[PDB]
Amino acid sequence: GELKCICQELKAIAKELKAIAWEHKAIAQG
Amino acid sequence: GELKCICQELKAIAKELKAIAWEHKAIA
Amino acid sequence: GELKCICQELKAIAKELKAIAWEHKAIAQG
Amino acid sequence: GELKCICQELKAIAKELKAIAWEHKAIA
Amino acid sequence: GELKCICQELKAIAKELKAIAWEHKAIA
Amino acid sequence: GELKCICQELKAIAKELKAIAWEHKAIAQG
Numbered sequence: 801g802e803l804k805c806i807c808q809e810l811k812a813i814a815k816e817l818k819a820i821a822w823e824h825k826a827i828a829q830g
Numbered sequence: 831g832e833l834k835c836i837c838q839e840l841k842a843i844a845k846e847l848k849a850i851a852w853e854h855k856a857i858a
Numbered sequence: 859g860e861l862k863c864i865c866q867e868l869k870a871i872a873k874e875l876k877a878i879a880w881e882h883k884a885i886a887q888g
Numbered sequence: 889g890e891l892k893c894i895c896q897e898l899k900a901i902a903k904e905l906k907a908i909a910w911e912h913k914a915i916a
Numbered sequence: 917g918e919l920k921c922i923c924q925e926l927k928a929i930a931k932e933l934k935a936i937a938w939e940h941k942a943i944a
Numbered sequence: 945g946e947l948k949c950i951c952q953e954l955k956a957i958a959k960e961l962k963a964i965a966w967e968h969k970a971i972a973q974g
Binding site: 860861863864867868870871874875877878881882884885 | 919920922923926927929930933934936937940941943944
């Protein structure tokens with residue numbers, strides 16, 4: 801069960817980092 | 831119990847990153 | 859020994875990200 | 889398939905962090 | 917030696933995040 | 945093969961976070 805959780809949470813982490821990346825780009829573009 | 835710990839900490843990490851993401855949403 | 863280290867370092871990582879999150883909120887609040 | 893998933897997601901994470909890093913390069 | 921590598925890299929990651937955190941402390 | 949990938953990607957992640965850290969410091973220094 802632990803490995804499934806780890807997979808799931810890393811998916812969430814990748815998701816949020818993409819959001820942060822897109823927000824940085826948006827901020828830089830004015 | 832290491833794998834359980836790893837799962838738990840990653841949950842926390844995901845939570846904090848969401849908080850950071852929603853902050854960036856603000857201020858464009 | 860490796861898995862213990864991994865657990866320990868992820869604890870540290872979660873800690874620092876919470877710090878960063880709180881600092882962002884503080885910055886946004888003026 | 890959990891280990892494969894973990895590998896794949898870490899790839900994505902590395903990719904996004906590089907994007908963030910290059911943004912910071914801009915604006916000094 | 918993969919698990920050792922993972923441990924080592926996570927140590928580095930924690931270190932860099934602490935640096936980033938203390939930067940944010942500055943500038944409020 | 946999966947563990948090798950995980951090791952490799954974490955190396956990349958550590959690398960980018962160091963870059964981000966250095967950029968923050970540079971920004972703070974004016």
